[PDB]
Amino acid sequence: HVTKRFDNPVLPFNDGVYFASTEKSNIIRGWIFGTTLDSKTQSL
Description:
Organism: Severe acute respiratory syndrome coronavirus 2
Radius of gyration: 14 Å
PDB class: viral protein
Structural class: little secondary structure
Keywords: Spike, SARS-CoV-2, viral protein
Protein name: Spike protein S1
Shape: extended
Helix content: under 10%
Name: Spike glycoprotein
Strand content: under 5%
Distance between the termini: 29 Å
């Protein structure tokens, strides 16, 4: 909060990705993966 630090940009997924999370309050909720993110393609 402090800046409000709303960090959540689109990032590439080249050949597999390592995600590490430090949490204390169950704040990260999920993940989305795909190509265009506009229902033109199939996304998960």
